[PDB]
Symmetry: D2
Subunit: 121 residues, 4 copies
């Protein structure tokens, strides 16, 4: 793939992929595994977010993509989505700022750049 | 996409997609959401499988693909995987046979046929 | 493929493919074979255009895509190009208006819709 | 693209792309432009081969791919084709051996590795 690696739930600044994206690129992502967003036995999350028996605020404790400090939903993954801004791709477990210290585990994520922007001319 | 729909957790025979696959095709799948594989408060499953605070045997209670009565791991998703046998793609919550009655909920799944088999000649 | 067929050189209005494209879709095309853009034995064209021993004006006698009555270069083919406007894909041998009567032959063309527009959100 | 560049018609050993393909990968290629396979005014060829008013033996003076010292037709291009052998992708103007000395020009070729072999399992 274009990048595969682990996304630690404790990394408040997320994980750098080294992928530089341009508006109009298309990408696909899949994410596997389990993390904790708190020490309580219930505070598990898949990339899609917290287990529904303990919901958290909108988009919190979900896997997101940061592109140039814009934030996009990813969750368990996306297929052939258009990149709407230029920027480096950072993957982030979107916990509340300052609450990462009780997080543990990591997701295994694959990213494919399906295409680089080139328009019909 | 080529197919998008829900896959009920209580469907012992899965969800038929109507996608007729051939050996050599390649597909991508992403799966979102949550299901219950049992009545207990901890018996939640992502497509990847049960939440690890109540682990189940390998592959059990995970989203799988059935093609020609063969099962293949899918989980939260797969990217550009080659199909090894002809048959219609069936999406299945791979619970223990006979234990589908205590299941509820459904996953939301998208399937893309990335390519139809054609070799260099 | 999504569409495969022949594009006749003598069709002043091109060949309608039935592929309804939206802005943001991406497509790939490959074009094979040879056509006559005139009755002389020198007036041969590949999809990229006239054989350069009898050159014609820019874009003339080349395979182009017509979408929303706008013309885009295709030639021998394109890979993963972004569609800039909505409309049915029309494949056109781009001969001088009024000069299609002395044309003959057809290209063998394949089109794949690589993705349907869907932005990260 | 994974690789793009020129394929000189006078290169008897073709052009090495540095793409190391594996059996089960899929690729797309498109090739543009015109070359001479001889010094006479009619000995032009597109990637699909010579202009048909001076036809040459089958596959001669076409753009082919060499992988594992086997030969595959490419021509003006191919979409999402499965690679049947392991090797580096070599792009070659398939002139009769020993007759490259009267060739000139080059095709402009783009190659995309559409996917790397990974089966459903
Ligand atoms: O160093 C050597 C190089 C070549 C050959 C050597 C030694 O020895 C022998 C000994 C033999 O007993 C018989 C043949 C050969 C050699 C050979 C010489 C010419 C041709 N084709 C000829 S003349 N006309 C077809 C139209 O011509 C155009 O198309 C061509 C492609 O079809 C080329 O691109 C050519 O450039 C272009 O003008 C074939 C052969 C062969 O090998 O089959
Ligand atoms: O019976 C009739 C026969 C011919 C013509 C008739 C009636 O009426 C009109 C009325 C007008 O108002 C203007 C022109 C014509 C007639 C005509 C048509 C074509 C050309 N040549 C041109 S443009 N470029 C030279 C290379 O030509 C090749 O390439 C071309 C693309 O570049 C095309 O594909 C062409 O087909 C192919 O041969 C000249 C005339 C003319 O007579 O000037
Ligand atoms: Ca936390
Ligand atoms: Ca159960
Ligand atoms: Ca004409
Ligand atoms: Ca030659």
């Amino acid at each position: 793939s274009d990048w595969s690696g682990s996304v630690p739930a404790n990394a408040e600044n997320g994980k750098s992929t080294g992928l530089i994206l341009k508006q109009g690129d298309t990408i696909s992502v899949v994410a596997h595994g389990w993390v904790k967003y708190g020490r309580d036995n219930v505070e598990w999350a898949a990339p899609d977010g917290p287990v529904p028996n303990n919901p958290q605020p909108s988009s919190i404790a979900t896997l997101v993509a940061k592109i140039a400090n814009k934030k996009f939903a990813i969750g368990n993954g996306v297929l052939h989505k258009t990149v709407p801004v230029d920027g480096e791709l950072i993957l982030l477990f979107n916990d509340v700022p300052g609450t990462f210290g009780d997080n543990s585990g990591e997701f295994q994520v694959e990213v494919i750049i399906e295409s680089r922007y080139s328009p019909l001319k």
